[PDB]
Design a protein around this ligand. Structure first.
Ligand SMILES: Cc1oc(CNc2ncnc3[nH]c4ccccc4c23)cc1C(=O)O
Length: 167
Protein backbone atom coordinates (compact mmCIF):
# COMPACT_ATOMS: atom_id res chain seq x y z
CA UNK A 1 0.00 0.00 0.00
CA UNK A 2 1.21 3.54 -0.85
CA UNK A 3 -0.16 7.09 -0.35
CA UNK A 4 -1.05 7.96 -3.97
CA UNK A 5 -4.78 8.86 -4.15
CA UNK A 6 -7.38 9.34 -6.91
CA UNK A 7 -5.47 7.56 -9.70
CA UNK A 8 -7.12 5.51 -12.42
CA UNK A 9 -5.41 2.12 -12.84
CA UNK A 10 -4.36 1.52 -16.47
CA UNK A 11 -2.36 -1.70 -16.05
CA UNK A 12 -0.81 -3.88 -13.37
CA UNK A 13 1.83 -1.19 -12.73
CA UNK A 14 0.76 2.10 -14.40
CA UNK A 15 -1.65 4.61 -12.83
CA UNK A 16 -2.79 8.03 -14.12
CA UNK A 17 -4.38 11.19 -12.69
CA UNK A 18 -5.24 14.73 -13.83
CA UNK A 19 -2.94 16.63 -11.50
CA UNK A 20 -0.25 19.27 -11.25
CA UNK A 21 2.90 17.22 -10.56
CA UNK A 22 4.22 20.02 -8.30
CA UNK A 23 1.18 19.90 -6.03
CA UNK A 24 1.10 16.13 -6.15
CA UNK A 25 4.75 15.95 -5.09
CA UNK A 26 4.19 18.49 -2.29
CA UNK A 27 1.44 16.33 -0.83
CA UNK A 28 2.76 12.83 -1.30
CA UNK A 29 6.50 13.54 -0.82
CA UNK A 30 7.26 10.47 -2.96
CA UNK A 31 10.59 8.69 -2.83
CA UNK A 32 11.14 9.66 -6.50
CA UNK A 33 9.70 12.47 -8.61
CA UNK A 34 10.68 12.44 -12.29
CA UNK A 35 11.68 15.67 -14.01
CA UNK A 36 11.26 16.21 -17.75
CA UNK A 37 14.86 17.37 -18.09
CA UNK A 38 17.07 18.45 -20.96
CA UNK A 39 20.71 17.41 -21.34
CA UNK A 40 21.96 20.67 -19.80
CA UNK A 41 19.59 20.44 -16.80
CA UNK A 42 18.40 23.95 -17.63
CA UNK A 43 15.00 23.95 -15.95
CA UNK A 44 13.42 26.84 -17.78
CA UNK A 45 9.87 25.81 -18.58
CA UNK A 46 7.37 23.02 -18.80
CA UNK A 47 7.49 20.50 -15.99
CA UNK A 48 11.14 21.30 -15.25
CA UNK A 49 10.53 25.02 -14.87
CA UNK A 50 7.59 24.37 -12.53
CA UNK A 51 9.46 21.84 -10.39
CA UNK A 52 12.47 24.13 -10.15
CA UNK A 53 10.33 27.15 -9.24
CA UNK A 54 8.73 25.12 -6.44
CA UNK A 55 12.24 24.48 -5.01
CA UNK A 56 13.00 28.23 -4.99
CA UNK A 57 15.71 27.57 -7.65
CA UNK A 58 17.60 25.09 -5.43
CA UNK A 59 17.10 22.41 -8.11
CA UNK A 60 18.84 24.66 -10.67
CA UNK A 61 21.74 25.45 -8.32
CA UNK A 62 22.32 21.74 -7.66
CA UNK A 63 21.96 20.96 -11.37
CA UNK A 64 24.51 23.57 -12.41
CA UNK A 65 27.07 22.00 -10.07
CA UNK A 66 26.22 18.53 -11.49
CA UNK A 67 26.82 19.71 -15.08
CA UNK A 68 30.02 21.56 -14.17
CA UNK A 69 31.39 18.28 -12.75
CA UNK A 70 29.95 15.70 -15.15
CA UNK A 71 29.00 17.45 -18.40
CA UNK A 72 25.65 17.05 -20.14
CA UNK A 73 23.40 14.04 -19.98
CA UNK A 74 22.59 11.91 -23.04
CA UNK A 75 19.20 12.11 -24.72
CA UNK A 76 17.49 9.02 -23.29
CA UNK A 77 19.63 9.23 -20.14
CA UNK A 78 19.09 10.31 -16.55
CA UNK A 79 20.67 11.27 -13.26
CA UNK A 80 19.48 11.10 -9.65
CA UNK A 81 19.69 14.34 -7.68
CA UNK A 82 17.96 15.70 -4.60
CA UNK A 83 14.19 16.01 -4.49
CA UNK A 84 14.54 19.12 -2.31
CA UNK A 85 11.16 19.98 -0.71
CA UNK A 86 9.22 17.88 -3.24
CA UNK A 87 10.50 14.29 -2.87
CA UNK A 88 13.41 12.34 -1.46
CA UNK A 89 15.03 12.16 -4.91
CA UNK A 90 14.48 13.70 -8.32
CA UNK A 91 15.18 11.46 -11.31
CA UNK A 92 16.03 13.87 -14.13
CA UNK A 93 15.16 12.01 -17.35
CA UNK A 94 15.89 13.37 -20.85
CA UNK A 95 13.29 12.37 -23.38
CA UNK A 96 13.77 13.34 -27.01
CA UNK A 97 12.62 16.86 -27.88
CA UNK A 98 10.80 16.72 -31.21
CA UNK A 99 11.17 20.50 -31.48
CA UNK A 100 14.95 19.84 -31.65
CA UNK A 101 14.67 16.99 -34.18
CA UNK A 102 15.65 14.22 -31.76
CA UNK A 103 14.86 10.60 -32.57
CA UNK A 104 11.55 9.53 -31.04
CA UNK A 105 12.85 5.96 -30.69
CA UNK A 106 14.93 7.35 -27.82
CA UNK A 107 11.70 7.67 -25.85
CA UNK A 108 11.84 3.97 -24.94
CA UNK A 109 15.41 4.36 -23.66
CA UNK A 110 14.26 7.34 -21.58
CA UNK A 111 11.47 5.34 -19.94
CA UNK A 112 13.87 2.45 -19.19
CA UNK A 113 15.44 4.69 -16.52
CA UNK A 114 12.22 4.35 -14.51
CA UNK A 115 12.88 0.61 -14.02
CA UNK A 116 15.73 1.43 -11.61
CA UNK A 117 13.14 2.72 -9.08
CA UNK A 118 10.39 0.68 -7.46
CA UNK A 119 7.84 3.53 -7.33
CA UNK A 120 7.82 6.92 -9.11
CA UNK A 121 5.66 10.00 -9.59
CA UNK A 122 6.22 11.15 -13.15
CA UNK A 123 5.03 13.19 -16.12
CA UNK A 124 4.64 11.74 -19.58
CA UNK A 125 8.09 11.95 -21.13
CA UNK A 126 8.54 14.06 -24.26
CA UNK A 127 5.00 15.48 -23.88
CA UNK A 128 4.17 19.15 -23.53
CA UNK A 129 6.86 21.48 -24.83
CA UNK A 130 8.96 18.50 -25.89
CA UNK A 131 6.62 18.07 -28.81
CA UNK A 132 5.79 14.35 -28.85
CA UNK A 133 2.30 12.88 -29.03
CA UNK A 134 1.28 12.20 -25.40
CA UNK A 135 -0.85 9.21 -26.47
CA UNK A 136 2.31 7.67 -27.94
CA UNK A 137 4.27 8.56 -24.82
CA UNK A 138 1.70 6.77 -22.66
CA UNK A 139 1.88 3.68 -24.88
CA UNK A 140 5.69 3.57 -24.65
CA UNK A 141 5.45 4.05 -20.88
CA UNK A 142 3.06 1.12 -20.45
CA UNK A 143 5.14 -1.09 -22.76
CA UNK A 144 8.51 -0.20 -21.15
CA UNK A 145 8.13 0.56 -17.44
CA UNK A 146 7.73 -2.48 -15.19
CA UNK A 147 7.99 -0.67 -11.85
CA UNK A 148 5.07 1.20 -10.31
CA UNK A 149 4.53 4.55 -12.00
CA UNK A 150 2.00 7.23 -11.03
CA UNK A 151 1.53 9.58 -14.00
CA UNK A 152 0.44 13.16 -13.36
CA UNK A 153 -1.17 14.87 -16.36
CA UNK A 154 -1.63 18.62 -15.88
CA UNK A 155 -4.18 19.24 -18.64
CA UNK A 156 -7.67 17.89 -17.88
CA UNK A 157 -8.65 17.80 -21.56
CA UNK A 158 -5.60 15.74 -22.45
CA UNK A 159 -6.12 13.49 -19.42
CA UNK A 160 -9.64 12.60 -20.62
CA UNK A 161 -8.34 11.93 -24.14
CA UNK A 162 -5.54 9.69 -22.81
CA UNK A 163 -7.98 7.62 -20.74
CA UNK A 164 -10.67 7.41 -23.43
CA UNK A 165 -8.20 6.29 -26.13
CA UNK A 166 -6.21 3.84 -23.97
CA UNK A 167 -6.00 0.30 -25.32
C1 LIG B 1 1.66 15.51 -21.45
C2 LIG B 1 1.24 16.85 -22.06
O1 LIG B 1 1.48 17.25 -23.28
C3 LIG B 1 0.98 18.43 -23.51
C4 LIG B 1 1.09 19.24 -24.82
N1 LIG B 1 0.87 18.44 -26.02
C5 LIG B 1 -0.48 18.10 -26.42
N2 LIG B 1 -1.47 18.43 -25.61
C6 LIG B 1 -2.73 18.14 -25.92
N3 LIG B 1 -3.02 17.52 -27.04
C7 LIG B 1 -2.08 17.15 -27.92
N4 LIG B 1 -2.15 16.52 -29.09
C8 LIG B 1 -0.93 16.37 -29.62
C9 LIG B 1 -0.51 15.77 -30.82
C10 LIG B 1 0.83 15.73 -31.14
C11 LIG B 1 1.77 16.29 -30.27
C12 LIG B 1 1.36 16.87 -29.08
C13 LIG B 1 0.00 16.92 -28.75
C14 LIG B 1 -0.75 17.43 -27.64
C15 LIG B 1 0.38 18.90 -22.34
C16 LIG B 1 0.54 17.85 -21.38
C17 LIG B 1 0.06 17.80 -19.93
O2 LIG B 1 0.65 17.07 -19.08
O3 LIG B 1 -0.94 18.48 -19.59
Amino acid sequence: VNSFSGYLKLTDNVYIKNADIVEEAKKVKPTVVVNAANVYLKHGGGVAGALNKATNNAMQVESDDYIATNGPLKVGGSCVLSGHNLAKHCLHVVGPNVNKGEDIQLLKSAYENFNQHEVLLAPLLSAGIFGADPIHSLRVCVDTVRTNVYLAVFDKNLYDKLVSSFL
